[PDB]
């Protein structure tokens, strides 16, 4: 079961800028009150970010690259963004990796799967019911040999919630690296509109796993009678992570509170030679 | 006064570096080999350090 | 005069050792007594996680035609604690066990298992030839001969494709030096040694660079605090003085490190709690007298 939906505005991409968003814990070590000159896979700061939309209309759900690392971003009400595909061929040869925070449970699968173009979860809509209820789950239709899998403990995510102005922001970070996929996570409330807020946060570790798949394609699966739905207001945002040093300040607890980018410009380049964040005539 | 901090510090920070061993740790390369391989490492670390 | 003479230093007391509450044993006997071994070019890796582990027994035993280890001592493995283990299981000729050590090259080592010069792990392996080897030759055991270049440390490639060490393209299955590149072993019981069947386990466990999983039976003592003791924190050994701290560790922290990479806090893996780490009193001394003339 899956249908190919189609009835919906058709638009070109849209760029925008990430000013100082997407740096994370890169170990498990304390450390306070110092500054502390890191290499890594970081996101470059002042970076042209992919905007893609789905509002009342817009939904695009495409096939997006993923080389080296993603900073994912989402400005979100009535939490519309649940799951995530990875893979490398998608189609029934190779293994591929599902993430699902449906309502029920949080689903994480490593399966010899088969989807279609349009996979996909849906709710159905306020039928007077007062709630907003589970009815899609047209994603894959075969599941051959499968070796991990978790289901974590139940519980009951909301559905509903109505403002103009989003308030949710998740940030992910994605990685795939000696076979271990690890996912960094943050959220923050935020009164923004239509763009990415402008500020400083960073992303604590939320998850490793050993799951030692190769990566190079993924897709987003969004929550919405073959045809003719509505859209959860919501904006999601794409970027991607690359080699570059970084000078990262702890201060007392411990607590990142200011990087510099270390090939940005000339002014940065020699803050980290001197390894300050101030420098005289 | 700053000449001074400068030079003890960068001599403070020459104790985390390989100089060719496995590890900088001293007591890594003692609890993980035994002794006639152990010469080996130590004797870079000396050197360096010296 | 004042001269200075030898220094001083406070001496520990006491030892200390600290583990993880693991107590089931692994699964080893599924590795090396298990029935069936599949290709060198088809290698099989299981992981091992989350049990004690038992190295000695293993190294005891007298089955083993070659036991040898490249980055650790194989007496001292029982006192250290991993993060993970992998065991990679095959089966090869009787000679070309030579070429699997670490940084060779060769047949094996450049088409079908090649070890990473940085290696930290120990090689086992002894013949069955009995075992596997019938008079008709259990020839599914295959490997592969010519590729496309040599394949980095720990990989693997699973195909059909056919080989053209000629200059011409060649199409469909099979031509003029068309060569499918998977050929089968003779083994047969009554071939010479040298061409008997071996087979071969590798492990190739991580070392002491995040939160451990796999120890070895050493049994926890108590806590002292406020005295110069040796501690042996989950294969962490020091000696200093234990305190309790104020540093707020985030759940996702096991340590504290210095700026000449010396750790200063730690937690302990029974009761989730942040300690301290001093070291000792340390100084000179100085002898102060009037000359030898005058008196002693
Ligand atoms: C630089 C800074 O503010 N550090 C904070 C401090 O202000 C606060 O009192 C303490 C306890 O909450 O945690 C830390
Ligand atoms: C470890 O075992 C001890 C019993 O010896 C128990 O008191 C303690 O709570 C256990 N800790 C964990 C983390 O299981």
Known sequence: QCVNLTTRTQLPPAYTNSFTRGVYYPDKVFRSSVLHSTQDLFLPFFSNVTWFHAIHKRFDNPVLPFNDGVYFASTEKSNIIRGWIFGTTLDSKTQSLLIVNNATNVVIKVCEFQFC???????????????????????????????????????????????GNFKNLREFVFKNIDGYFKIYSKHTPINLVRDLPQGFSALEPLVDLPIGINITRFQTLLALSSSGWTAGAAAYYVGYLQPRTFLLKYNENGTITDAVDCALDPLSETKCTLKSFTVEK | ??????????????????????????????????????????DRLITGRL | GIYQTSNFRVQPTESIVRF????????????????????????????????????????????????????????????????????????????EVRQIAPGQTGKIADYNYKLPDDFTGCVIAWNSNNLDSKVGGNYNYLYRLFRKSNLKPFERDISTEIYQAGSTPCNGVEGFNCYFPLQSYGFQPTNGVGYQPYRVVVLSFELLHAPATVCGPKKSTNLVKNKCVNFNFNGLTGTGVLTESNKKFLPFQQFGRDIADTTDAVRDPQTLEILDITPCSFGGVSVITPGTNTSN
């Open chain 3, 20 to 95: 993880p509450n693991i107590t089931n044993l692994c699964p080893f006997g599924e590795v090396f007594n298990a029935t069936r071994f599949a290709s060198v070019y088809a290698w099989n890796r299981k992981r091992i996680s989350n049990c004690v582990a038992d190295y000695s027994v293993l190294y005891n035993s007298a089955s083993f035609s070659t036991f040898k280890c490249y980055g650790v001592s194989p007496t001292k493995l029982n006192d250290l604690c991993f993060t993970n283990v992998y065991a990679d299981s095959f089966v090869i000729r009787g000679d």
């Open chain 1, 117 to 163: 173009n349009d996979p996909f979860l849906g709710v159905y809509y306020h039928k007077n019911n007062k709630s907003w209820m589970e009815s899609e789950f047209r994603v894959y239709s075969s599941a051959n040999n499968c070796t991990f899998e978790y289901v974590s403990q139940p519980f009951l995510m909301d559905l509903e919630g109505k403002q």
């Open chain 2, 1 to 42: 006064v700053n000449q001074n901090a400068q030079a003890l510090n960068t001599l403070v920070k020459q104790l985390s570096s390989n100089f060719g061993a496995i590890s900088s740790v001293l007591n890594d390369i003692l609890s993980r080999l035994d002794p006639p391989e152990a010469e080996v490492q130590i």
